[PDB]
From a paper:
Not only does [name]-[name] act as a buffer for calcium ions, but it has also been shown to interact with multiple protein targets to modulate their function or catalytic activity. [name]-[name] belongs to a superfamily of calcium-binding proteins that includes calmodulin and troponin C. All of these proteins have a high α-helical content and share EF-hand structures that constitute the calcium-binding domains.
Here, we report the first X-ray structure of [name]-[name], allowing the first detailed high-resolution analysis of its calcium-binding properties. Five amino-acid residues, a backbone interaction and a water molecule complete the coordination of calcium in the EF1, EF4 and EF5 motifs. At position 12 all four calcium-binding loops possess a conserved glutamate side chain that acts as a bidentate coordinating residue. Calcium binding at the N-terminal EF-hand (EF1) motif (where the electron density is more disordered) appears to be more flexible that in the other calcium-binding loops. It was not possible to build the two conformations into the electron density, and only one calcium-binding site is visible in the final structure. Here, we demonstrate that Asp24 and Asp26 are involved in calcium binding. Compared with the existing NMR model of [name]-[name], the X-ray structure is less compact, with the intramolecular distances increased by several ångströms across the molecule.
Numbering used by the authors: -2 to 65, 72 to 258
Amino acid sequence: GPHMAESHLQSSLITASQFFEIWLHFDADGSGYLEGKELQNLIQELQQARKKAGLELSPEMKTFVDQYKIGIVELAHVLPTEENFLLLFRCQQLKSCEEFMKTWRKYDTDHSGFIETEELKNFLKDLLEKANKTVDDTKLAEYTDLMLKLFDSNNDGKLELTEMARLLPVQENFLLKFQGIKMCGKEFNKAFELYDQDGNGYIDENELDALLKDLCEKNKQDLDINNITTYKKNIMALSDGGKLYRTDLALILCA
Ligand SMILES: [Ca+2]
Ligand SMILES: [Ca+2]
Ligand SMILES: [Ca+2]
Ligand SMILES: [Ca+2]
């Protein structure tokens, strides 16, 4: 359990289940990030643990302690995480927002608007096979279960776009700025109808640009008109060949 983290920080190599217990030990509010007292507790306990183990700090541990709000992905690279689990965070599909949006569309194969366990399993299996690793069904089931528990913020047993997007670095995750912009179904449906200006049933890139300019204007504290081109490019990656249907735009704007 999370109490075992003190023992885990002394390990030569940390299993995915151990990394999960470390995360839950320090993340006292379950917010998905270590900050303030939680981060200070990690810095103190990581150094005390390697000392108790009679070990030196690895180069990544030295660089982390020297330069310290950090998330789950950053912690996985600092610690001696087991190889096949750490490989799941060294994907260009989780480093570029545009490539992550294409990955979401690729792996939501039942068009449910969520990534369910079996879809997440297929994504992780494909990442491992791309790295030439032979997948063991038991460990893959364990990795999938732990990745879901780490990122399923609302505990509904599946991932929504904003949950899985937290695998991205803070700078690429534009969805953090769209948090308080999300609308209910009725209001969203009214906006979709307004912004489909030619009335052909979908929103194209020119129509999305008008939408994004209007959203920037009404949410000055959250969005930035100078990043419209990036917002446009990220959102167009969820489209069906340049066509944003109601369910595609709902992923970004509907609560
Ligand atoms: Ca926290
Ligand atoms: Ca799905
Ligand atoms: Ca969820
Ligand atoms: Ca249209």
